[PDB]
Design a protein around this ligand. Structure first.
Ligand SMILES: *S(=O)(=O)c1cccc(-c2nnc(-c3cc(Cl)c(O)c(Cl)c3)o2)c1
Ligand SMILES: *S(=O)(=O)c1cccc(-c2nnc(-c3cc(Cl)c(O)c(Cl)c3)o2)c1
Lengths: 115, 115, 116, 116
């Protein structure tokens, strides 16, 4: 609800289905603690990662397992994973969507932050 | 229904609202004939452009009026408009979403073609 | 020097070589006049399209023939071409680099504009 | 020569100058070891990070300090940094260019990989 991930495939023109996504929260000692994870749906989306109560301000990392995705399609890719690192800020709008558009040697990512 | 346009703003991290979009179909003589138009909604989307009956195979152009968008925000942009030119093909999946992610001096565009 | 085009392939992780590029300029009657054309090199770059004398103020369209590129590679892409339309030189001469990063169903484009 | 980083600004239409870049390499114990670092030049380019001797096979992370860039411009961006993680040189030495195109709430990144 407060956090959604959307993943698209630029080679096939389709949602990127069954992609593993792992979310981490930065701890006090600067290590990354597991926070949430799942796999994208048939629409390329992963909902239900967290709740408003748990998603407090801090630094988060969303790791999208792109290498496995491309390998399953028989395509050799560049990156190990796509990484998106950001601060959640209570001032700003309350719903974060992290989107990524994937190619074998490239990716784009954007944030849609709305109320 | 068969054609949707989605426009996002990479400067503000938000849907690009009230952006004019014009769709053209290539005519026999190679001119561009007006086909559909509208303005993006509060979610950055423009639905209802065409129907399955009218959206036959052919070459289409989607022109997104980015310059006016940026000017209304007080930002000086590079492009006159973003252009997306493609062939609609009956073989492939039946629903086309044309997405564009806008910055003042850059844009990205992708197609999500699904059934 | 005043206008350069750079094209990259996001599938291969390489320059996009032998990509045809056509530039047009909008005339006073609002039609698109052919202005220049060429092909990217083995570096993905196309230089020598125009001269500072010829490249006057106007609205220019840079058409990058992406479908022909992907088809010559045996691949069926979505777009016909990538089109970049911009006003040039309206505060005096500038140098423009138009870059594009290509995938079969997507592309990104940017401009680097510098003042000599 | 073996590793180059190029950064562009999608807001300004310019190179992204004075962008800090940190490269790490994954150690055998699975931690990220500092490998090299530098700043982009007035061309948006960072050269001289490593040597072909030093740049052995491994998993490398290129951290581009985008937040610091946008903040030094007085702008409040979304991301902390742009991170590019890849296996390098696992079929022998290659030359890698890592490119990034930056906006306040978005970035794109690509790689050009060539065989000397
Ligand atoms: S919307 O939720 O209906 C919707 C439909 C289709 C596509 C999108 C979407 N979300 N993000 C993107 C996108 C992200 C990036 Cl990083 C880039 O470069 C592009 Cl071109 C699109 O598309 C939303
Ligand atoms: S080259 O040095 O002459 C050159 C000039 C201008 C721009 C480039 C360049 N390199 N990469 C890119 C680029 C990267 C990405 Cl990730 C995206 O999305 C785009 Cl549109 C361009 O541009 C090289």
């Amino acid at each position: 609800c407060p956090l959604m991930v959307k993943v698209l495939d630029a080679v096939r023109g389709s949602p990127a289905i069954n992609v593993a996504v792992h979310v981490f929260r930065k701890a006090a000692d600067d290590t990354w603690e597991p926070f949430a994870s799942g796999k994208t749906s048939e629409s390329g989306e992963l909902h239900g990662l967290t709740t408003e109560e748990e998603f407090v301000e801090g630094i988060y990392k969303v790791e999208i397992d792109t290498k496995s995705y491309w390998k399953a399609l028989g395509i050799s890719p560049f990156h190990e994973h796509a990484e998106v690192v950001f601060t959640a800020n209570d001032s700003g709008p309350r719903r974060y969507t992290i989107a990524a558009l994937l190619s074998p040697y490239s990716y784009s990512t954007t944030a849609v932050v709305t109320n």
